[PDB]
Amino acid sequence: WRYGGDPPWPRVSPACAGRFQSPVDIRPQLAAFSPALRPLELLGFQLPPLPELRLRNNGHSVQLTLPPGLEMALGPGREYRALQLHLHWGAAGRPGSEHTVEGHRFPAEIHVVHLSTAFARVDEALGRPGGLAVLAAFLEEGPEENSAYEQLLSRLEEIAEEGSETQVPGLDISALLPSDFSRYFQYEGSLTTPPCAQGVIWTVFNQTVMLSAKQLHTLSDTLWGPGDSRLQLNFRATQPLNGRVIEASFP
Amino acid sequence: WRYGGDPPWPRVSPACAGRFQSPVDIRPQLAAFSPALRPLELLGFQLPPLPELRLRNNGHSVQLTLPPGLEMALGPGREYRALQLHLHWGAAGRPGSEHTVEGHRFPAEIHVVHLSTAFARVDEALGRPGGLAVLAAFLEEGPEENSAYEQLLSRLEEIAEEGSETQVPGLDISALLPSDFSRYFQYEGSLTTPPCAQGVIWTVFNQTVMLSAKQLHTLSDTLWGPGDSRLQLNFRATQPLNGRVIEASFP
Numbered sequence: 001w002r003y004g005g006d007p008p009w010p011r012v013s014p015a016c017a018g019r020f021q022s023p024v025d026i027r028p029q030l031a032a033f034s035p036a037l038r039p040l041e042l043l044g045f046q047l048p049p050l051p052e053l054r055l056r057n058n059g060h061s062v063q064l065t066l067p068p069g070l071e072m073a074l075g076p077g078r079e080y081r082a083l084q085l086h087l088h089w090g091a092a093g094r095p096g097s098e099h100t101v102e103g104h105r106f107p108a109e110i111h112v113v114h115l116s117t118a119f120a121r122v123d124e125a126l127g128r129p130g131g132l133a134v135l136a137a138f139l140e141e142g143p144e145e146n147s148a149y150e151q152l153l154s155r156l157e158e159i160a161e162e163g164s165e166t167q168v169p170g171l172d173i174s175a176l177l178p179s180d181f182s183r184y185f186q187y188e189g190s191l192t193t194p195p196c197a198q199g200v201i202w203t204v205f206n207q208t209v210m211l212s213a214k215q216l217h218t219l220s221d222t223l224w225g226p227g228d229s230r231l232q233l234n235f236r237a238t239q240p241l242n243g244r245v246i247e248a249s250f251p
Numbered sequence: 252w253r254y255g256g257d258p259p260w261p262r263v264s265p266a267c268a269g270r271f272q273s274p275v276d277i278r279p280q281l282a283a284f285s286p287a288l289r290p291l292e293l294l295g296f297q298l299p300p301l302p303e304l305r306l307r308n309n310g311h312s313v314q315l316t317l318p319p320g321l322e323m324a325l326g327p328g329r330e331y332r333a334l335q336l337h338l339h340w341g342a343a344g345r346p347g348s349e350h351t352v353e354g355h356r357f358p359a360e361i362h363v364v365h366l367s368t369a370f371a372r373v374d375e376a377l378g379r380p381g382g383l384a385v386l387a388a389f390l391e392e393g394p395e396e397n398s399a400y401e402q403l404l405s406r407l408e409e410i411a412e413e414g415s416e417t418q419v420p421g422l423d424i425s426a427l428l429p430s431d432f433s434r435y436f437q438y439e440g441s442l443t444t445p446p447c448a449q450g451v452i453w454t455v456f457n458q459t460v461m462l463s464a465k466q467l468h469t470l471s472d473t474l475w476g477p478g479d480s481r482l483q484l485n486f487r488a489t490q491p492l493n494g495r496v497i498e499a500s501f502p
């Protein structure tokens with residue numbers, strides 16, 4: 001499978017033709033205020049420098065594999081373990097976030113992919129209700145170098161080639177996310193890549209993460225993907241809600 | 252295991268001492284309204300008179316085995332199949348519902364136990380989030396004989412003995428439930444019997460169902476449990492919410 005051509009994703013995975021797919025366009029005025037949505041809780045996300053983590057150009061994204069003991073709760077009794085994070089981005093003067101807001105596409109988007117603690121392995125969780133939870137934040141331009149992101153972005157040159165990887169010191173993984181864990185949208189969707197399995201709980205933060213113009217340029221670019229092609233515009237088109245209601249932790 | 256058969260359930264089954272157990276006290280004023288909770292969809296519940304259904308005294312309840320094809324949705328793409336329904340009840344003028352509302356215990360409670368269509372087997376669903384969903388309705392005293400409930404109560408004589416069972420004509424299972432499928436409380440908890448597994452989605456109807464005093468007396472007076480004891484007060488004590496917010500489908 002790849003972005004921007006064949007095979008059709010449903011030939012790869014029938015679930016890529018499901019009714020309830022991600023990403024979606026968030027229209028905050030059609031969002032449902034639910035005060036049952038409490039602030040997210042992250043434990044164990046502040047890692048020591050050793051052991052190191054693996055950072056990989058997989059030809060679809062840059063992926064950081066997370067070690068055991070990163071605990072995330074969507075609320076009381078809704079418990080997850082973090083597996084990995086990866087990024088979606090565009091190209092020189094083209095935004096490449098997956099999710100959109102009132103049709104606006106942000107420069108880039110981070111995904112932190114988690115597994116329900118009721119499941120030992122991802123493949124057991126795929127297609128199961130609440131089996132996987134993703135935390136999603138938009139990356140936008142700010143005036144400062146983002147030092148947390150600099151630790152990954154400063155290493156993309158080393159992994160320019162499709163299928164290459166490097167080791168990086170442990171860092172504060174939660175510094176890659178917005179500081180505001182209270183304001184977010186939540187809906188039920190799918191993986192945005194094959195096999196596009198449904199039953200995924202998507203949390204999208206109100207607050208965006210700020211990178212320098214240079215940092216956003218580094219992210220788009222530096223990596224190469226399938227063939228002699230640049231790894232850019234690695235986002236799936238917006239998918240219809242098809243009767244789903246996005247909830248919001250705020251009115 | 253037994254109801255008030257001290258020693259306590261946590262020895263038989265230490266999941267019974269989990270943080271997120273059922274049942275709970277519903278306090279409507281503290282419930283979170285989410286306009287995302289849509290009306291329950293129950294299709295295939297209008298059963299023909301043939302085939303017959305197994306009705307059984309298991310010494311903990313009377314249980315009706317439900318056939319394939321009873322489809323239920325809690326939301327878009329969130330589907331279930333009904334497996335069985337069973338009742339919880341009191342004694343000679345002592346109420347026996349499992350959920351309470353602001354401390355009010357109701358005379359009885361019907362539970363309709365469903366299996367998520369993302370799970371082949373109940374034993375894969377036990378302990379997983381949303382694996383099982385129960386529809387729960389309160390049984391109150393009203394002036395009239397309940398038609399739907401007569402079909403089950405009229406047959407308890409035949410199975411008064413722990414372990415006994417009979418075939419009963421098909422019936423409209425949906426007729427056992429309240430009027431308004433748009434008005435319910437919802438939270439996540441556990442089986443209210445051993446093994447007390449967590450991840451059960453509980454839906455409790457706002458509106459009740461009315462049975463005659465003769466009918467309520469029949470329910471609690473006709474059946475025998477373990478030992479030479481009456482099958483009565485077959486309900487678990489109220490469990491703490493521990494931070495879980497109960498949701499409501501209505502402002």
Ligand SMILES: COC(=O)CCCNC(=O)c1cc(S(N)(=O)=O)c(Cl)cc1SC1CCCCC1
Binds near residue numbers: 111192195
């Ligand atoms: C060698 O090339 C690849 O591995 C491509 C896989 C890219 N997909 C993911 O890493 C991924 C993305 C999401 S997303 N964008 O919806 O947040 C999620 Cl939720 C999970 C995974 S990993 C999954 C994909 C294959 C089946 C099990 C592991």
Ligand SMILES: COC(=O)CCCNC(=O)c1cc(S(N)(=O)=O)c(Cl)cc1SC1CCCCC1
Binds near residue numbers: 337362443445
């Ligand atoms: C057959 O008698 C027994 O010994 C086991 C106790 C019966 N319990 C249930 O039937 C039961 C009750 C609920 S409840 N009160 O929370 O709604 C639920 Cl959700 C499921 C079951 S059946 C389940 C229990 C053990 C594993 C197989 C199926």
Ligand SMILES: [Zn+2]
Binds near residue numbers: 086087088111192
């Ligand atoms: Zn992603």
Ligand SMILES: [Zn+2]
Binds near residue numbers: 337338362
């Ligand atoms: Zn029950």
